[PDB]
Amino acid sequence: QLGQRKYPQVVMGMGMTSGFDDGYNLTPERQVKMAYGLGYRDWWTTYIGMSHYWKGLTAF
Amino acid sequence: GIGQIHFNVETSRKVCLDLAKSVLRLVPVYPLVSPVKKQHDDYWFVGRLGLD
């Protein structure tokens, strides 16, 4: 077991905006719970990735 | 204690050479061909959204 800090914060009545290109590596479970704990409760806006959502392939 | 049952390394080598000639008579040319034909410098490396 490893020690960890977990201090919930009072809600300031604001939403959170995030980008997919900056959150693909992190699991969705860790991102949502962390942001929710800080106090962002009502709204969420996610900008789709620029080069990580569409299908594609490489060829000669 | 056994005798002479197995070929020599040289004699078995001659047998393998005869086997190679027998197969080449049946198949005179290489039957396989790769999709690519030119050198690596003659093909672009590009990406596409897909076939359609």
Tokens 């039957």 sit on residue: B31
Q: How far apart are CA A21 and CA B3, in angstroms?
A: 76
Considering only CB atoms, A57 lies closest to which of B43, B45, B50, namely: B50
- Read out DSSP for B1-52? ---S-S--HHHHHHHHHHHHHHHHHH--S-----S--S-GGGS--EEES---
**Chain A residues with CB inside 8 Å of B44's CB?**
60
- A56 interface with B at CB cutoff 8 Å: yes
- Show the tokens assigned to B9: 């390394």
Those residues with Cβ within 8 angstroms of residue A45's Cβ, 6 or more apart along the chain or in another chain: A15, A16, A17, A18
The radius of gyration of chain A's CA atoms, rounded to the nearest angstrom, is 16
Q: Resolution of the experimental model in angstroms, please? A: 3.7
Task: Please name the residue of chain A whose CA is at the shortest distance from the CA of residue B35.
Answer: A60
- Show the tokens assigned to B16: 């393998």
**Chain A residues with CB inside 8 Å of B36's CB?**
60
- B49 interface with A at CB cutoff 8 Å: yes
Do the beta carbons of residue A52 and residue A19 sit within 8 Å? no
Q: How far apart are CA A57 and CA A53, in angstroms?
A: 13
Those residues with Cβ within 8 angstroms of residue A52's Cβ, 6 or more apart along the chain or in another chain: A20, A21, A24
SS3 A30: helix
Do the beta carbons of residue A33 and residue A59 sit within 8 Å? no
Nearest-Cα distance to chain B for A59, in Å, is 6
Q: How far apart are CA A28 and CA B42, in angstroms?
A: 44
SS3 A10: coil
Rounding to the nearest 10 degrees, give the CA dihedral for residues B7, B11, B17, B18.
-80
- Which method, experimentally, gave rise to this model? cryo-EM
**Chain A residues with CB inside 8 Å of B47's CB?**
56-59
Rounding to the nearest 10 degrees, give the CA dihedral for residues A36, A39, A41, A44.
-70
Those residues with Cβ within 8 angstroms of residue B2's Cβ, 6 or more apart along the chain or in another chain: none
